[PDB]
Design an enzyme around this catalytic site. Structure first.
Site, PDB file in Angstrom:
ATOM      1  N   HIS A 110       0.838  -1.211  -0.010  1.00  0.00           N
ATOM      2  CA  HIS A 110      -0.116   0.036   0.136  1.00  0.00           C
ATOM      3  C   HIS A 110       0.982   1.208  -0.082  1.00  0.00           C
ATOM      4  O   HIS A 110       0.315   2.437  -0.226  1.00  0.00           O
ATOM      5  CB  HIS A 110      -0.847  -0.208   1.285  1.00  0.00           C
ATOM      6  CG  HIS A 110      -0.372   0.442   2.550  1.00  0.00           C
ATOM      7  ND1 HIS A 110      -0.154  -0.509   3.387  1.00  0.00           N
ATOM      8  CD2 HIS A 110      -0.313   1.601   2.917  1.00  0.00           C
ATOM      9  CE1 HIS A 110       0.430   0.308   4.622  1.00  0.00           C
ATOM     10  NE2 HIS A 110       0.231   1.563   4.302  1.00  0.00           N
TER      11      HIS A 110
ATOM     12  N   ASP B  72      -0.125  -7.494   1.973  1.00  0.00           N
ATOM     13  CA  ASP B  72       0.405  -6.194   1.913  1.00  0.00           C
ATOM     14  C   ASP B  72       1.798  -6.099   2.083  1.00  0.00           C
ATOM     15  O   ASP B  72       2.262  -5.829   3.033  1.00  0.00           O
ATOM     16  CB  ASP B  72      -0.264  -5.397   3.146  1.00  0.00           C
ATOM     17  CG  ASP B  72       0.009  -3.590   2.919  1.00  0.00           C
ATOM     18  OD1 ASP B  72       0.420  -3.415   1.989  1.00  0.00           O
ATOM     19  OD2 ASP B  72      -0.035  -3.306   3.658  1.00  0.00           O
TER      20      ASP B  72
ATOM     21  N   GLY C 266       2.450   6.742   9.038  1.00  0.00           N
ATOM     22  CA  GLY C 266       3.893   7.233   8.914  1.00  0.00           C
ATOM     23  C   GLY C 266       4.812   6.222   9.048  1.00  0.00           C
ATOM     24  O   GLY C 266       5.972   6.064   8.622  1.00  0.00           O
TER      25      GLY C 266
ATOM     26  N   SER D 124       4.004   3.117   8.202  1.00  0.00           N
ATOM     27  CA  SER D 124       3.532   2.162   7.236  1.00  0.00           C
ATOM     28  C   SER D 124       4.771   1.570   6.446  1.00  0.00           C
ATOM     29  O   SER D 124       5.744   2.458   5.863  1.00  0.00           O
ATOM     30  CB  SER D 124       2.402   1.807   6.399  1.00  0.00           C
ATOM     31  OG  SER D 124       1.133   2.485   6.983  1.00  0.00           O
ATOM     32  N   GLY D 125       5.195   0.200   6.123  1.00  0.00           N
ATOM     33  CA  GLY D 125       5.998  -0.474   5.451  1.00  0.00           C
ATOM     34  C   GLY D 125       6.934  -0.607   6.294  1.00  0.00           C
ATOM     35  O   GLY D 125       8.096  -1.510   5.714  1.00  0.00           O
TER      36      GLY D 125
HETATM   37  C1  LIG Z   1       0.811   3.616   7.566  1.00  0.00           C
HETATM   38  O1  LIG Z   1       1.881   4.136   8.572  1.00  0.00           O
HETATM   39  C2  LIG Z   1      -0.539   3.572   8.230  1.00  0.00           C
HETATM   40  C3  LIG Z   1      -0.338   2.495   9.430  1.00  0.00           C
HETATM   41  C4  LIG Z   1      -1.260   2.912  10.765  1.00  0.00           C
HETATM   42  C5  LIG Z   1      -0.874   1.762  11.799  1.00  0.00           C
HETATM   43  N1  LIG Z   1      -2.051   1.868  12.693  1.00  0.00           N
HETATM   44  C6  LIG Z   1      -2.118   1.181  13.857  1.00  0.00           C
HETATM   45  N2  LIG Z   1      -1.112   0.365  14.062  1.00  0.00           N
HETATM   46  N3  LIG Z   1      -3.046   1.067  14.578  1.00  0.00           N
HETATM   47  N4  LIG Z   1      -1.661   3.085   7.315  1.00  0.00           N
HETATM   48  C7  LIG Z   1      -2.447   3.729   6.991  1.00  0.00           C
HETATM   49  O2  LIG Z   1      -2.818   4.787   7.165  1.00  0.00           O
HETATM   50  C8  LIG Z   1      -3.526   3.010   5.961  1.00  0.00           C
HETATM   51  C9  LIG Z   1      -3.188   1.429   5.675  1.00  0.00           C
HETATM   52  C10 LIG Z   1      -3.871   1.396   4.298  1.00  0.00           C
HETATM   53  C11 LIG Z   1      -4.429   2.598   3.719  1.00  0.00           C
HETATM   54  C12 LIG Z   1      -4.118   3.547   4.773  1.00  0.00           C
HETATM   55  C13 LIG Z   1       0.910   4.624   6.215  1.00  0.00           C
HETATM   56  N5  LIG Z   1       0.967   4.064   4.916  1.00  0.00           N
HETATM   57  C14 LIG Z   1       0.793   5.034   4.077  1.00  0.00           C
HETATM   58  C15 LIG Z   1       0.544   6.319   4.631  1.00  0.00           C
HETATM   59  C16 LIG Z   1       0.256   7.499   3.841  1.00  0.00           C
HETATM   60  C17 LIG Z   1       0.489   7.264   2.332  1.00  0.00           C
HETATM   61  C18 LIG Z   1       0.862   6.023   1.882  1.00  0.00           C
HETATM   62  C19 LIG Z   1       0.847   5.032   2.743  1.00  0.00           C
HETATM   63  S1  LIG Z   1       0.549   6.357   6.517  1.00  0.00           S
END
Ligand SMILES: *[C@](=O)([C]([C][C][C][N]C([N])=[N])[N]C(=O)[C]1[C][C][C][C]1)C1=NC2=C([C]=[C][C]=[C]2)S1
Ligand SMILES: [Ca+2]
Length: 223
Positions: free
Chosen positions: A40, A84, A175, A177-178
């Site tokens: 993602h 993912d 922030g 994520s990944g």
């Molecule tokens: C990721 O950092 C976040 C993760 C949040 C983790 N929450 C917990 N542990 N409670 N993911 C997201 O905001 C989503 C997952 C799928 C769609 C939105 C990020 N990944 C991205 C961000 C910004 C832009 C692109 C990917 S924040």
């Protein structure tokens, strides 16, 4: 990361920051030319940044390398976030040293109760927004699949696992994520998703890396 602590300059040498003019996702270096992140997090024009601590200040140990290719898992579903995971190849091999090292892939899956280290430059507030410039860390155990599925009914797959505290207060956030989830020296998870951040009964959901070792090894060897 919410409720975590400052890791300390390059104490997580495998942690990388994906940059497209700004940090947007975390990643894990698995070898001199490959990084593992969340599908993602995919996007074009990705520059991988290694050996980073403060992502807004050049401290002398960072390595900025452009990505030559990106490979999202063949079965990645953006709606459910199932599978993912994605691989990112570096245009040129990274210089591995002390601040820049790779993390080993799992040889088998980890069990509930196992403590892991989750890290990233994501939001540090659960009821607001404040992004850190320095790498944040958090020790969190893997939760039982039952408690994971209970928290997110009809949303958890065999390719995901929950980690954190059901009481809330500590968790990954936007922030992050990944980013990596390392348990016993192995990359067992990838920051994927969750409902809010550090909210009670809403733990973080992570991509179950142990399910993709074959795909990772085969894909890297063929690219
Ligand atoms: C990721 O950092 C976040 C993760 C949040 C983790 N929450 C917990 N542990 N409670 N993911 C997201 O905001 C989503 C997952 C799928 C769609 C939105 C990020 N990944 C991205 C961000 C910004 C832009 C692109 C990917 S924040
Ligand atoms: Ca820096």
């Amino acid at each position: 990361i919410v409720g975590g602590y400052t890791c300390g300059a390059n104490t997580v040498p495998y942690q990388v920051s994906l940059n497209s003019g700004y940090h947007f996702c975390g990643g894990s270096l698995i070898n001199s030319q490959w990084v593992v992140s969340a599908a993602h997090c995919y996007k074009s024009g990705i520059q991988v940044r290694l050996g980073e601590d403060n992502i807004n200040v050049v401290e002398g140990n960072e390595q900025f390398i452009s990505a030559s290719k990106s490979i999202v898992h063949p079965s990645y579903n953006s709606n459910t976030l199932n599978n993912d995971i994605m691989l990112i190849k570096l245009k040129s091999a990274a210089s591995l040293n002390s601040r820049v090292a790779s993390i080993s892939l799992p040889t088998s899956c980890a069990s509930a109760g196992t403590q892991c280290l989750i890290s990233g430059w994501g939001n540090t507030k659960s009821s607001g927004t404040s992004y850190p410039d320095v790498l944040k860390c958090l020790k969190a155990p893997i939760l039982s699949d039952s408690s994971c599925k209970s928290a997110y009914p009809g949303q958890i797959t065999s390719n995901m696992f929950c980690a954190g505290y059901l009481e809330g207060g500590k968790d990954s956030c936007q922030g992050d994520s990944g980013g990596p989830v390392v348990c016993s020296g192995k990359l067992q998870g990838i920051v994927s998703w969750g409902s809010g951040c550090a909210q009670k009964n809403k733990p973080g959901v992570y991509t179950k890396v142990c399910n993709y070792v074959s795909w990772i090894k085969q894909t890297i060897a063929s690219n």
